[PDB]
Amino acid sequence: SAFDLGFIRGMTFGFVGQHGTWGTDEARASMRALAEQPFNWVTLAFAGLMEHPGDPAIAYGPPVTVSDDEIASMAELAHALGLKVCLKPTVNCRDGTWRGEIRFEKEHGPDLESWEAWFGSYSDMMAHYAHVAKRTGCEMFCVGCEMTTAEPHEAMWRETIARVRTEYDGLVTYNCNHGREEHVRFWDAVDLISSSAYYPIDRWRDRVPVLREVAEAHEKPLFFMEVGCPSRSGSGACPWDYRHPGAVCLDEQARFYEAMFAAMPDEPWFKGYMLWEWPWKLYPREAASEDGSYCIYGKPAEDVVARAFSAIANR
């Protein structure tokens, strides 16, 4: 039962998972550092590529992504360090279009620029990596991330998930974007509801009640498969924006984490936090004060999180 899952104190690693990058000594060192934090989970996240948001072809595997061996190598390392592992393949667009906005002028037809064709490629990709997750003992598999335009294609999502279930016996989640939790119609097909909970600092309190209602309505636990904030000025107001025009501001990131932890209640429907994110090439701690990324390492947010996560664990 998903209801039995230990509360998640997690971190996403390695995105976007470019070929060869996880096979490095730098990546192994970065994973060792991640496991020294009070985390019980890591998510191995990487992205295949679509040429454009209206092209149904998806390039995955070498030379674009980390190899299956690289995946296995990082999973084995994480497991040897006592972490549970979620595998999260997703898709990006080479022109930089958000995957939540992919669009096809046609619905059906495998050889056409259609949703049917796109789901064919996507499902091939997910089926392959579900098998990898099974062969490498990954405790969770994430079947999608922020696919807002794809979500209404419910029958096709259910087809995708059914195929994943034949290839993989562990926990399955789908990760919707913030504000989509109540709109997704196939939560029954997965084990855990999850979201990219990039809520601005001032929105947390008002949003919790809907999160509770979604979990209770669907009789499923809910967690955050992504949550985080860049350490840049003003970023707390738009935590999802990774190219925010502002100077480094460590305290802003720490303010995001305080607001989130202050808002979330200690209730059974809520299963925790998969933080965004940790790089395969980790900067020295000294260099932290100069870093504007989502990474919390070496920053005041590291302590806010440690304090919060250590309190949870040692309870």
Ligand X SMILES: OC[C@H]1CNC[C@@H](O)[C@@H]1O[C@@H]1O[C@H](CO)[C@@H](O)[C@H](O)[C@@H]1O
Q: Which is nearer to ligand X, 7 or 276 (CB)?
A: 276
Report the nearest approach of ligand X to the CB of residue 89 (Å): 13
What SS3 string covers 226-253?
EECCCCECCHHHCCCCCCCCCCECHHHH
Task: Verify binding: residue 302, ligand X, rule CB under 6 A.
Answer: no
Q: Which of 176, 179, 171 is nearest to 150 (CA)?
A: 176
**Contacting residue, 186, 242, 261, 283, with ligand X by CB under 6 A:** 242
Task: Verify binding: residue 283, ligand X, rule CB under 6 A.
Answer: no
The residues, any chain, with a CB within 8 Å of residue 307's CB and separated by 6 or more, are none
Q: Which is nearer to ligand X, 92 or 160 (CB)?
A: 92
- Per-residue x/- marks for ligand X, 170-209, CB under 6 A? --------------------------x-------------
**187, 213 Cβ separation under 8 angstroms:** no
Report the nearest approach of ligand X to the CB of residue 4 (Å): 28
List helix spans (H) across the chain: 25-35, 68-80, 115-135, 154-167, 204-218, 250-263, 300-313
Q: Which is nearer to ligand X, 131 or 203 (CB)?
A: 203
Q: Which is nearer to ligand X, 194 or 196 (CB)?
A: 196
Encoding tokens for residue 225?
């498969």
Task: Verify binding: residue 30, ligand X, rule CB under 6 A.
Answer: no
Q: Which is nearer to ligand X, 14 or 120 (CB)?
A: 14
Report the nearest approach of ligand X to the CB of residue 277 (Å): 5
Q: Which amino acid is at 115?
A: W
Q: Is 294 exposed, middle or buried (0-12, 13-18, 19+ CB in 10 A)?
A: buried
Interactions with ligand X, residue window 113-132 (CB under 6 A): none
**271, 225 Cβ separation under 8 angstroms:** no
Task: Verify binding: residue 224, ligand X, rule CB under 6 A.
Answer: no
Identify the DSSP state of 185.
Answer: S
- Per-residue x/- marks for ligand X, 260-279, CB under 6 A? ----------------xx--
| Closest residue to ligand X, based on beta-carbon distance | 242
Q: How far apart are CA 135 and CA 171, in angstroms?
A: 14
Task: Verify binding: residue 146, ligand X, rule CB under 6 A.
Answer: yes
Report the nearest approach of ligand X to the CB of residue 142 (Å): 12
Task: Verify binding: residue 240, ligand X, rule CB under 6 A.
Answer: yes
Task: Report how far apart, in Å, the C-alpha atoms of 128 and of each of 42, 67, 85, 101 are.
Answer: 20, 12, 17, 24
List helix spans (H) across 136-220: 154-167, 204-218
Task: Verify binding: residue 16, ligand X, rule CB under 6 A.
Answer: yes
Report the nearest approach of ligand X to the CB of residue 100 (Å): 9
**In the block, residue with structure tokens 């296995």:** 72
Report the nearest approach of ligand X to the CB of residue 91 (Å): 10
Positive or negative, the CA dihedral 45, 47, 179, 227 is: positive
Report the nearest approach of ligand X to the CB of residue 92 (Å): 5
Q: Which is nearer to ligand X, 23 or 100 (CB)?
A: 100
**Contacting residue, 92, 123, 160, 253, with ligand X by CB under 6 A:** 92
Q: Which is nearer to ligand X, 114 or 149 (CB)?
A: 149
Looking at the chain, the residues that come just before a C–N gap of over 2.5 A are: none
Binding site for ligand X (CB under 6 A): 15-16, 92, 146, 196, 226, 240, 242, 276-277
